[PDB]
Amino acid sequence: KQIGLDQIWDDLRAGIQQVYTRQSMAKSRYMELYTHVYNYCTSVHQFVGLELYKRLKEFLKNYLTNLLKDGEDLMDESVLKFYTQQWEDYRFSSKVLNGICAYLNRHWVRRECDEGRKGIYEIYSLALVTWRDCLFRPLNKQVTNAVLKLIEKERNGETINTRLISGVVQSYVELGLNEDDAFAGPTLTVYKESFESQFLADTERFYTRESTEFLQQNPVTEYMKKAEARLLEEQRRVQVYLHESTQDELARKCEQVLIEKHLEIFHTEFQNLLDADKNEDLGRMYNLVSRIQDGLGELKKLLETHIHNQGLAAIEKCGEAALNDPKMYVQTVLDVHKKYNALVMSAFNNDAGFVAALDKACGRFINNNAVTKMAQSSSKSPELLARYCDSLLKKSSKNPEEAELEDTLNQVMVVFKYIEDKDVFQKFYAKMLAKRLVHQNSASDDAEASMISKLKQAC
Amino acid sequence: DPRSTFVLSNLAEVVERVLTFLPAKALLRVACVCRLWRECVRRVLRTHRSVTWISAGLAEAGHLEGHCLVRVVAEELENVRILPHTVLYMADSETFISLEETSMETALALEKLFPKQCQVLGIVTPGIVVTPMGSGSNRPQEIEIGESGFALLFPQIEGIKIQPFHFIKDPKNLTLERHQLTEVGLLDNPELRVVLVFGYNCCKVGASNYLQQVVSTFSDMNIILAGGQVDNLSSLTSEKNPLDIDASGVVGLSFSGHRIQSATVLLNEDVSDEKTAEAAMQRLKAANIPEHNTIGFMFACVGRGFQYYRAKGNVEADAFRKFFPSVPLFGFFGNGEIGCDRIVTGNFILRKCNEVKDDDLFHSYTTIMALIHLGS
Amino acid sequence: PSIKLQSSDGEIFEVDVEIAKQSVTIKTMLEDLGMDDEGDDDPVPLPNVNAAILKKVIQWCTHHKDDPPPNKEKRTDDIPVWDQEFLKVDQGTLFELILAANYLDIKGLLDVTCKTVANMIKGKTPEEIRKTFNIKNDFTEEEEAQVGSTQFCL
Amino acid sequence: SVFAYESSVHSTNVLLSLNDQRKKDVLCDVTIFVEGQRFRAHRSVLAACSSYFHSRIVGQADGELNITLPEEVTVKGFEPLIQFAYTAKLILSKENVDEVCKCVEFLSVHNIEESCFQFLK
Amino acid sequence: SVFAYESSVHSTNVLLSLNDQRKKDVLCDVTIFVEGQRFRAHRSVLAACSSYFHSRIVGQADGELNITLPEEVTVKGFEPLIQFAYTAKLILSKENVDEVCKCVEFLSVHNIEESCFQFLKF
């Protein structure tokens, strides 16, 4: 014997109630609160059944009910300074209670469980199962509706005082259901139903109360720049409001609330933002719609159907001399495929699909374009090109630069791919080529030999 | 006079972390020390969820009267740690003959050492392929003609129930009405997941077709078949029949539980070298069968081995542990093959549509593997 | 690192903190509570172990301070050379180490001492074991008679 | 050379996720007006669990729906029924058996046996 | 006195009734296009069976939504998949494996594992 069973619950409840209300528990008495609980659990007179577990459930439910009395009459900014201060005074406090009753946490709780019954937990995990007597009581309606009031200070309110909110969110994650199962992934089950579900519904409203209030008083060119800030700001309102598992799901429901449901006046503004030489707005604009799918391919036809309404304007301003002036019909189209090449290079991040816009759309103003129509021949377009390359690759006053001899031909190679009908080029090139070779009217024989080498690369 | 008249007789937690550091046989000796020790013995004999295997290698060909396997099982059972409940042992077909057959002497010898309550199935094959004692990292050794054998000790595992079955042949009778499939549990069992059908003395006509008929009764379910044809039987614990050596039949284990995962790969005539064999066992790895608490099986044909793959041996065994890092391996060489391609787990079943009748089971000149995850 | 412990009879011994952290009970109190301005070198009065035993425990902790804790192997008889040299002591004190190992929760010390008890248990018959530990002799002979009757075997 | 893939957990998970959908506004397209309070469900599960709903749900055009059970059913005997329909578990007590049994024999819900017969007491 | 009933046949029969309702267009409220071969299904079933028909199915009205899938998925991989989405049985064949596996990641249909497919001989 040497222990007893009722002498213990007259001095144990003098430090078990003094470890709570933390008051510098000396190590000199900690081992006295162990020697009791240890002796209580090693005797036969027989661990006095399970009473100590029950008596340790009443005291916790008395420090958690006599304490609810102060706090459940409090409005915002006060229940948020009560469930962040007296949570660190129960997480810390009931962790000394996890090693004062160590001998009741190792043998009986692992032998009283894994046998014949339930409702047996480690005393620490018992504390945060009876902590759902102050949570399924205010808080779940009184901080969740209060944290949102604080988190809804994105507008102007600085000094959010993150510390209070960080305590709340980490509390819900920590309160993850350890009831039953075993002491095994994550515990984000009491987080979804109390600070994720009722945080997203209240983050749609704050944004669809500024989205269609800013595109009614300001142009679209500022929604294209607020979006980037807010979509980035709601990626830094994580990592201080946390446990993650919300970055990939808050961002999406901040992305169809800003630009996926306003994709009606973006295409309309796209046209306006395309006649102008504006080149930085499209980059931000492309970035916004880069995140959204199903619509990256809609603002892809408009650009494809803008160079074509731009290509038959420059060769239209070429005039009438274009028929009997070979360089003009080549330089003009080349200018069109210089400026809008940079657009599909700098602005839209050299997208492979967007290159297709700078592609065949360019083909459809080189095959059946003007000038060719006027002197009706689809075959005419190669001929003007054919004369151009020969025009420069001829014996003349003087071949001025060896570099210009490559780059112009290299530039010629670019527009070659789009003509869609090679045959005429081989004819007209060869005919006057024969005149060239017979009379030796060419300089730097390698350059032309380089041209068929480029032709060897081509068809 | 010392303190532990109190301590060693009242303190429960100290009598528990003592009887764990004892051989299994001693654990049932101290079970009658006093009344508290009994409870401690039962608790310790319940945290036993590991299968233990005993084998007899070729390096113990002692030139003395006695079976090699019986000698090892005599010495090793003293140091065994778990209490065996069901046991499956195989040995080569020269260690059960003393005059022309003798068979009882070798058989009952092993049938005596094992506990009376334990269930023993005795099967003899022409060839034993076995992993030696120790850990799960031992390199498997493939033994053709030569005295070798292994014994598998299955302890009491919660939620998993294993029951042997035996259908003797007949001179003239019915086939199987219904009840023998319910007596042992091959039918009407919602949790049958692995079966290990074996067959013996199938040489005679009708008996060769007996294995054809008996399997179809309990086939077509979401179970894994495995095994083949062997020589003869040695010992079965049914307590109602003196075993007849001349009669043929079908015997095997019938695994049943809620967490018994399985896997099976056929090795057809399309594998003839190291790279092809490793490709086949890579498919087994893709089944995501867990590593721990699994035992592997390999049933092959006597025409495969040294002769079939050019001048090499231990080739299937080496490839098994090439991709599976610590699983053991046990299997026999026989004159028949049973199996298909199929994975059954807690969720998914990957049967072969095999729409003809049942022509996806009885192969010849091939090898079958298995990954029976006994436990969880 | 310096921590002073006090035995039950009133003796004080100074030990290293890390060597004391070998015991789980000492380190748990010293890590979840000791994160404050400590009482000035205040002794920790373990009131269940006398002066003599605390030396034996601390002697074991002094040698076994470089052991990486890993873990689940088949039970064996390794019992390193030092322990049985330490453990050749009369019957009573070995039992007192069991309480000291169990009270402070020293898995290594509890692991070793229980081995020798099992070894002393091994190689004996059930009945004879009483003449070396003096256990009681009870419960309906019958139960025994129909209890210790479900085994041997193997 | 044709292989199958037969699962054994898809049915339970799809039923549980449909029940979660049932308890959360979206994708629910029918309301059961019973005795004054509101119950909201799907027009696909209820046409599969029984025949009374099946005979009244088909043919009629899509849109807002009241399929009010007029007076005969109770609410104490109604709440467990849709729970069984969407989750396949029942909640029976000694003060619940009679109304639930009255509801099953009326609505003719399938996959429920009369085994709720002598379990009481 | 909570006995609680548990039926092991209440889920399979419900999913078979959903299939039967699908076949003869009995309250099908969603139409989906793959290339062009019109398919019919239930909004609720696909709202939970997959995890792409849970982001392109919510936030709409009761008016029937006609969602379309790009050419990256085809009809050779969907018909096996949508039949498994209703009967929990997915037939595989020689030409099926590649496309039926390629369909999964674009839909992330639940309770199907795309690592077991790399086991078939075929």
- Residue B339 falls within a domain, yes or no? yes
Resolution (A): 3.9
**Cα E105 to Cα E102: distance, rounded to the nearest angstrom:** 6
**How many whole angstroms separate alpha carbon D47 and alpha carbon D108?**
12
* Domain presence at residue B364: yes
Handedness of CA D67, D73, D76, D77 (dihedral sign): negative
Q: Which of E116, E118, E121 sits opposite B348 (nearest CB)?
A: E116
SS3 call for A358: helix
CA distance A193 to A141: 11
Q: B26 in helix, strand or coil?
A: helix
Task: Give yes or no for D7 touching B (CB within 8 A).
Answer: yes
E36-41 contacts, C-beta under 8 A, 24 or more apart = E37/E75, E39/E78, E39/E82, E41/E82, E41/E85, E41/E86
Residues of D in contact with B260 (CB under 8 A): none
Q: Which residue, A103, A135, A150, sits at the end of a domain?
A: A150
Question: Which whole-number Å values give the CA distances from E102 to A244, E78, E118, in the listed order?
Answer: 30, 10, 13
Q: Is there a contact between B57 and B147 (Cβ–Cβ < 8 Å)?
A: no
Q: Which two tokens stand for residue B346?
A: 């807690």
Q: Based on the structure, what is the number of domains in chain B? A: 2
Q: Letter for the amino acid at B339?
A: G
Whether residue A193 lies inside any domain: the answer is no
Cα dihedral angle (C118, C119, C125, C129), rounded to 10 degrees?
-70
Concatenate the DSSP letters of all residues of E18-54 into one string.
HHHHHHTTSS--EEEEESS--EEE-HHHHHHHSSSTT
Q: Which residues of A239-257 are buried (b: 16+ CB within 10 A; e: fewer)?
A: eebbbeebeeebeebbbeb
Domain residues for A433?
387-457
Contact B218, B172 (CB under 8 A): no
What is the dihedral angle through the alpha carbons of E75, E81, E84, E86, rounded to the nearest 10 degrees? Answer: -70
CA A59 to chain CA centroid, Å, is 48
Residue C47 in domain: yes
* Cβ <8 Å between D17 and E48: yes
> At A401, which CATH number?
1.20.1310.10
Q: For residues A312 and A365, is the Cβ–Cβ distance under 8 A?
A: yes
- Order of strands, edge to edge, in the sheet holding E39-41? E39-41, E30-34, E66-69
Cα-based distances in Å from B218 to B33, B46, B187, C140: 48, 33, 6, 49
Q: Angle at Cα B221 formed by Cα B217 and Cα B225, nearest 5°?
A: 80
Dist CA C26 CA A284 (whole Å): 61
Q: Please check whether residue B92 is in contact with residue B148, taking contact to mean a CB–CB distance below 8 angstroms.
A: yes
Q: Which amino acid is at B140?
A: P
d(CA D97, CA C92): 66
Among the listed residues C11, C96, C98, C102, the one whose alpha carbon sits nearest the alpha carbon of residue C51: C11
User: Minimal CA–CA distance to A193: which of A251, A231, A136?
Assistant: A136
* Amino acid of residue E99: E
What's the token pair of residue B138? Answer: 């031992």
| Secondary structure element (H or E) that encloses residue B194, with its range | strand B192-195
Q: Which two tokens stand for residue A127?
A: 């504390």
Residues in chain D: 121
Query: Which candidate, A17, A171, A176, A177, places its Cα nearest to that of A100?
Result: A17
In a domain? residue B302: yes
Q: Which residues pair with B233 in a beta bridge?
A: B123
Contacts 24+ apart (CB under 8 A), A323-327: A323/A371, A323/A374, A323/A375, A326/A384, A326/A387, A326/A388, A326/A391, A327/A388, A327/A391
Instruction: Kindly state whether residue A23 falls inside one of the protein's structural domains.
Output: yes
3-state SS, residue C74: coil
Comparing CA positions, the residue from C6, C107, C113 lying closest to residue C54 is C6
Token pair listed for B23: 């051989």
Q: Token pair of B77, please?
A: 């059972």
What's the rounded Cα separation, in Å, for the pair B212 and B357? 12
Which single residue is written with the structure tokens 């300074």? A81
Q: Please report whether residue A395 resides in a domain.
A: yes
Chain E residue whose CA is closest to D6: E89
Give the residue from A150, A177, A198 where a domain finishes: A150
Domain boundary among A104, A120, A150: A150
Give the pair of three-digit tokens for residue B130.
Answer: 């076995």
- Residue C97 belongs to a domain: yes
In a domain, A308, yes or no: no
Residue A326 forms part of a structural domain:
no
User: Would you state the structure tokens that stand for residue C124, as one six-digit string?
Assistant: 């004996």
- The total number of structural domains in chain C stands at 1
Alpha-carbon D117 to chain mean position = 20
Domains annotated on chain E, with CATH: 10-105 (3.30.710.10)
DSSP state of A192: I
Residues A20 and B340: their CA atoms lie apart, in Å, by: 65
Give domain status of residue B207, yes or no: no
Which of the other chains make 3 or more beta carbon contacts under 8 angstroms with chain D?
Answer: B, E
Q: Is residue B286 included in any domain, yes or no?
A: yes
- Compute the distance between CA of residue B265 and CA of residue B47 in angstroms, rounded to an integer: 33
On whether the CB atoms of residues B123 and B90 are closer than 8 A, the answer is yes
What residues of chain E lie within 8 A of the CB of D93, using their CB? 1-2
Q: Which residues on neighbouring strands pair with residue B370, listed in sequence order?
A: B297
Contact across the interface for E93 and D21, Cβ inside 8 Å: no
Please tell me the distance in Å from E59's CA to the nearest CA on chain B: 33
C154, part of any domain: no
Domain count, chain A: 2
Tokens of B9: 């007789």
Q: What is the domain range of residue C92? A: 3-147
Which residue has 């790009």 as its token pair?
E70
**Cα angle for residues E96, E99, E105 (degrees, 5° grid):** 130
Q: State residue A84 phi and psi, 5-degree precision.
A: -130, -20
**Which residues, at least 6 apart from D51, have a Cβ–Cβ distance to it below 8 Å?**
D107, D108
Distance from CA of B19 to the nearest CA of A (A): 16
In eight-state DSSP terms, residue A95 is G
- DSSP classification of residue B349: E
What is the SS3 assignment for chain D? CCECCEECCHHHHHHHHHHHHHCCCCCCCEEEEECCEEEEECCCCHHHHCCHHHHHHCCCCCCCCECCCCCCCCCCCCHHHHHHHHHCECCCCCCCHHHHHHHHHHHCCCCCCCCCCCCCC
Q: How far apart are CA C58 and CA B148, in angstroms?
A: 52
Q: Which residue of E has its CA nearest to D3?
A: E92
Q: Are D80 and D96 in contact (CB under 8 A)?
A: yes
- Is B236 within a domain? no
CB contact set of A325 (below 8 Å; sequence gap of 6+): none
Taking CB atoms and an 8 Å limit, are B12 and A107 in contact across chains?
yes
E39-41 vs B198-200, strand pairing mode = unpaired
Contacts of A289-293 with CB under 8 Å at 24 or more apart are A289/A259, A289/A263, A290/A349, A291/A231, A291/A255, A291/A259, A292/A255, A292/A256, A292/A259, A292/A260, A292/A263
The answer to whether residue C152 is domain-embedded is no
Among residues C85, C87, C96, C91, which one has the least CA distance to residue C7?
C96
Single out the residue of E56, E4, E9, E12 nearest to residue E30, CA to CA: E56
Question: How far, in Å, CA of A86 to CA of C123, rounded?
Answer: 59
CA-based nearest residue to C111, from A267, B195, B20: B20
What range does the domain containing B365 cover? Answer: 266-372
* CA nearest to A19 within chain C: C33
Instruction: For residues D112 and D104, give the distance between their C-alpha atoms in angstroms, rounded to a whole number.
Output: 8
Dist CA C23 CA C90 (whole Å): 24
Domain-embedded: residue A56: yes
B353/D2 CB distance under 8 A:
yes
DSSP symbol at A194: I
CA dist A396 → A391, A430, A441 (Å): 9, 19, 8
What distance in Å separates residue C101's CA from the closest CA in chain B?
Answer: 10
Residue E100, burial from CB neighbour count under 10 angstroms (0-12, 13-18, 19+): buried
Query: What angle (nearest 5°) sits at the alpha carbon of residue C26, between those of residues C21 and C30?
Result: 85
Question: How close B368 comes to chain C (CA, Å)?
Answer: 32
Tokens encoding A322: 């274009």
The residue among E105, E106, E101, E96 whose CA lies nearest residue E118 is E101
